[PDB]
Chains A and B, each alone.
Chain A
Amino acid sequence: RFYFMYMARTTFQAVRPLLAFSVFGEVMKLVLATMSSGLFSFLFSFVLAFEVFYFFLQCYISYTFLTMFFTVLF
């Protein structure tokens, strides 16, 4: 069972950035497709920037957990 647990954890930590980049991207794309005015766009630019920062945070977390999971003593 430990092998299954480990592979689950590894795959989750590996796909975390892909999710942050793809599904939240689809949400942003829905919003872009639906919005027309200028005030809402001005306010949504900051959401896009926050998504940038969140993607970088997820990438850092994944890097940390992956260097923990792929570190061998011998």
Chain B
Amino acid sequence: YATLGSGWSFSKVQYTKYRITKPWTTDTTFDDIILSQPSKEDFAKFTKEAPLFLRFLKLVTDVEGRQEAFIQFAKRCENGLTVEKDVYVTKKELVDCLWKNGYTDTEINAFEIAFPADYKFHYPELAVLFDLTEEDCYKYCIRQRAATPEELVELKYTKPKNLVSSYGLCFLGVWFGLSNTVLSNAWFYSKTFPFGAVFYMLGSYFYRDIREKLWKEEKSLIHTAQENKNMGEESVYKQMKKYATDTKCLDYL
């Protein structure tokens, strides 16, 4: 899968000996979006409070000239909006999109003063607010969540499957794999355990030296690329600024 994201930060991770833990739930389970490849029905649902968003929506609709949409959405959303839980876009991402796409400072400041910093917009809100399709908003939210896939997403819990057949096959595996002298062989004790243990000890002792010695070149390349990009962009910008005043010759003439 492609590596999505607009960040130039070369980021690597170090692991611990502890597993990720989430609050107990009898119906949901947390998993990685790329490893699960979930669908809209696999996603878990919950109810969100409307008023704070419905006020801003009424304002925007009175400004744009479409109140039927507000009325329909409010009658749909009363008693809370039932929506997929981990399909959203953050306020910061939305503000960046608005700014780069040309929404005015007044509208951006309205967004900022209206919604908290940790607010999370979902695809129905986005669709009713920008006169778009919930399908497109869902796809956009999914892409923006995959851009930050370190955060687990909440799916519906499903019991395990095929446990009986798996038990049969695992019994067959042990019955055919442990009925031997492999784990007691001179080959084992002379090559498999010594070589493997030496590799493991060396890896545990030089775990970080190796990683750094490997990543040095990639870090240098990324730094070089970013520097070149910055210098070129700055030069072009300042030169166009110099030549910006070459249009008034006509209106002077």
A residues sitting closer than 8 Å to B (CB atoms) are 38, 41-42, 45-46, 48-49
Contacts and interface: CB of A to CB of B under 8 A. Distances in A.
B164 A46 contact: yes
A37 to B, nearest CB: 10
A23 B176 CA distance: 25
Contacts of A38: 172, 176
Contacts of A42: 168-169, 171-172
Interface in B155-175: 164, 167-169, 171-172, 175
A35 to B, nearest CB: 9
B167 A41 contact: no
Contacts of B172: 38, 41-42, 45
A42 B171 CA distance: 7
Nearest to B175: A41
A38 B175 CA distance: 9
A48 B164 CA distance: 12
Nearest to A35: B175
Interface size bracket, B side: under 10
Given A45-B172, A46-B164, 15 more contacts: A38-B172, A38-B176, A41-B171, A41-B172, A41-B175, A42-B168, A42-B169, A42-B171, A42-B172, A45-B167, A45-B168, A45-B171, A46-B168, A48-B171, A49-B167
Nearest to A43: B168
15 contacts: A38-B172, A38-B176, A41-B171, A41-B175, A42-B168, A42-B169, A42-B171, A42-B172, A45-B168, A45-B171, A45-B172, A46-B164, A46-B168, A48-B171, A49-B167
Nearest to B176: A38
B180 to A, nearest CB: 14
B157 to A, nearest CB: 25
A30 B172 CA distance: 18
A45 B169 CA distance: 9
A27 B164 CA distance: 23
A52 to B, nearest CB: 11
A46 B166 CA distance: 11
Contacts of A41: 171-172, 175
Interface in B163-222: 164, 167-169, 171-172, 175-176
- State the 6 A-B residue pairs at the shortest beta-carbon distance, nearest first: A45-B171, A45-B168, A42-B168, A41-B175, A42-B172, A41-B172
A41 B168 CA distance: 9
Contacts of A46: 164, 168
A49 B168 CA distance: 10
B179 to A, nearest CB: 10
A42 B167 CA distance: 9
A49 B164 CA distance: 10
B170 to A, nearest CB: 9
Nearest to A48: B171
Contacts of B171: 41-42, 45, 48
